[PDB]
């Protein structure tokens, strides 16, 4: 959450989308990736 590689952080967002993990985690992982200027790595339209 606080410290983690983009590969793992993104792997969480990616994994969560596949398993249908809680929206809070999906949004949480996306909220970090979003603030990290890595919203392009995700399947989002920035």
Which CATH number belongs to the domain containing residue 17 in this structure? 1.10.287.1100
Domain membership of residue 19 as a residue range:
4-37
What the block records as the tokens of 23 is: 């929206």
At which residue do the structure tokens 């989308």 appear? 17
- How many structural domains compose the chain? 1
- Tell me if 23 is assigned to some domain: yes
Contact 8, 33 (CB under 8 A): no
- Cα 19–chain centre separation: 13
Q: Does residue 21 lie within any of the structural domains?
A: yes
* Torsion sign over Cα 16, 21, 25, 26: positive
State the greatest distance between any 2 C-alpha atoms of the chain, in Å, as a whole number: 25
**Which positions ≥6 away from 28 have C-beta within 8 Å?**
1
Chain CA centroid to CA 15, Å: 9
Q: Is residue 42 part of a domain?
A: no
- Measured from the Cβ of residue 41, the count of other Cβ atoms closer than 10 Å reads 15
Q: Is residue 14 part of a domain?
A: yes
| Burial of residue 9, with CB atoms counted within 10 A of its CB: 0-12 exposed, 13-18 middle, 19 or more buried | buried
Whole-number Å distance between alpha carbons of 24 and 26: 5
Question: Is residue 9 in a domain?
Answer: yes
Residue 44 lies in a domain: no
Please, which experimental method was used?
A: NMR
Burial classification of residue 13, based on how many CB atoms lie within 10 Å of its CB (0-12 exposed, 13-18 middle, 19 or more buried): buried
């Amino acid at each position: 959450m606080r410290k983690l590689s983009d590969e793992l952080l993104i792997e969480s967002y990616f994994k969560a989308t596949e398993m249908n993990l809680n929206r809070d985690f999906i949004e949480l992982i996306e909220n970090e990736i979003k603030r990290r200027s890595l919203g392009h790595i995700i399947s989002v339209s920035s």
